[PDB]
UniProtKB/Swiss-Prot annotation, chains A, B:
Organism: Homo sapiens
GO cellular component assignments: extracellular region; lateral plasma membrane; plasma membrane
Subcellular location: Cell membrane
Entry's Gene Ontology BP terms: mucociliary clearance; pigmentation; Wnt signaling pathway, planar cell polarity pathway
Tissue expression profile of the protein: According to PubMed:11956595, ubiquitously expressed. According to PubMed:12011995, expressed specifically in testis and ovary.
Family: Belongs to the Vang family.
Annotated protein name in UniProt: Vang-like protein 1
Organism domain of life: Eukaryota
Record keywords: Cell membrane, Disease variant, Membrane, Phosphoprotein, Transmembrane, Transmembrane helix
Pathological association: Neural tube defects: Congenital malformations of the central nervous system and adjacent structures related to defective neural tube closure during the first trimester of pregnancy. Failure of neural tube closure can occur at any level of the embryonic axis. Common NTD forms include anencephaly, myelomeningocele and spina bifida, which result from the failure of fusion in the cranial and spinal region of the neural tube. NTDs have a multifactorial etiology encompassing both genetic and environmental components. Sacral defect with anterior meningocele: Form of caudal dysgenesis. It is present at birth and becomes symptomatic later in life, usually because of obstructive labor in females, chronic constipation, or meningitis. Inheritance is autosomal dominant.
Subunit composition and interactions: Heterodimer with VANGL2. Interacts through its C-terminal region with the N-terminal half of DVL1, DVL2 and DVL3. The PDZ domain of DVL1, DVL2 and DVL3 is required for the interaction.
Effect of residue 115 to S: In NTD; uncertain significance
Cytoplasmic compartment residues: 1-230
């Protein structure tokens, strides 16, 4: 349900959809199906077992609230472990055996590898960062003089689709679903859907409304103030 | 499962059981079956639905931990509400219309009645304090110059059986269950059970062990100390 708005001009549904995809790879966080599993299992669990029945759900124990709070606590714990690990690992090498940033990354990686693995498993990001990619970005951060937090912000948040590998984004399989012809221009109220392999960008188009402006003159003599209460 | 120990001399099981009952009405908190309902319902709920099956229970959500924490939070909230209510209600009357402590209790009770009712319902003590008894103890506290907390400590904790009304303790229906004759004296290892209408005092008797003492002489010359670390 990640939602973003975009102004466009007079474009066809095709061109508007392609601008939407450009902005999708730029702006939206990357599609992580692992982050979607819990809901599915919860739904399936309700499958394993109408107003009064919902009433009894409210009177029941909210497992989801406490599970989310505990998971948030665990994620913050793993995050602080990871920050300490990466700070110590960057402090293990001096700028000045002389070695290139690739060998420096390979030298300091085993002192951050377990904490990073645990954080990427607790945030379900382990399928998006291979060890080779982590070493590549690590030598990148060592080369460009970045801090542990600058290295680590790629791994803390989910991040958009273009942070990741080229086989990760399936630019080839996008499918434009429009009720009308896709060569028709945009108008108010049309809905087109850009379907990928497992998700879909439901895009509804609204007209930017007709706006009326009018001057009213506020005199700087009218900005008087008194010490009395209001 | 409230458990207390008592030393006794050479008594028969009858006399030891009666000392146990004297100390029961003195020392043990009063039998509250309402506080026992939750477990029963939980058991019945497990009835509504062997090592691996327990393993899966550990991997499940611990509803009881969070429910107990939330109930404790609610009890403390109601407790602070009750303390503020009773403090304001006692501050509404001066020692110095002139009225006896009964009418003073009836005058200040409606300013504490709702908070006290909510606290006795959240602690499941509403069947143990009638309004007449609360007014009686309230006029008692107003008479003897006690503070709001001194009035309120009867209602905060569960309290033993003799705080409450005379029909509350069923002194007449106690039943002594012993495997041997109850006129026999106590010895090591015997178990007798004092059954009331819904609970039972399981009492096991142990011998106070044979103790050997011996002098060792610690010289006050041997209490020397140095500033060095240990």
């Amino acid at each position: 349900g990640e939602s973003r708005f975009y102004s466009l001009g007079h474009l066809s549904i095709q061109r508007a959809a392609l601008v939407v995809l450009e902005n999708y790879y730029k702006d939206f966080t990357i599609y992580n199906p692992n982050l979607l599993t819990a809901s599915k299992f919860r739904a399936a669990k309700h499958m394993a077992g109408i107003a009064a029945a919902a009433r009894r759900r409210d009177s029941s124990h909210n497992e989801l609230y406490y599970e989310e709070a505990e998971h948030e606590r665990r994620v913050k714990k793993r995050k602080a472990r990871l920050v300490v690990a990466v700070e110590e690992a960057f402090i293990h090498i001096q700028r000045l055996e002389v070695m290139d940033p690739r060998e420096a990354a390979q030298a300091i990686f085993p002192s951050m590898a377990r904490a990073l693995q645990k954080y990427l498993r607790i945030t379900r990001q382990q399928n998006y960062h291979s060890m080779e990619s982590i070493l590549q970005h690590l030598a990148f951060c060592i080369t460009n003089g970045m801090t542990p937090k600058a290295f680590l912000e790629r791994y803390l948040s989910a991040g958009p689709t273009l942070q990741y590998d080229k086989d990760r984004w399936l630019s080839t399989q996008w499918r434009l679903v429009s009720d009308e012809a896709v060569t028709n221009g945009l108008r108010d109220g049309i809905v087109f859907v850009l379907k990928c392999l497992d998700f879909s960008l439901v895009v509804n188009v609204k007209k930017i409304p007709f706006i009326i402006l009018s001057e009213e003159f506020i005199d700087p003599k009218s900005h008087k103030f008194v010490l009395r209460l209001q």
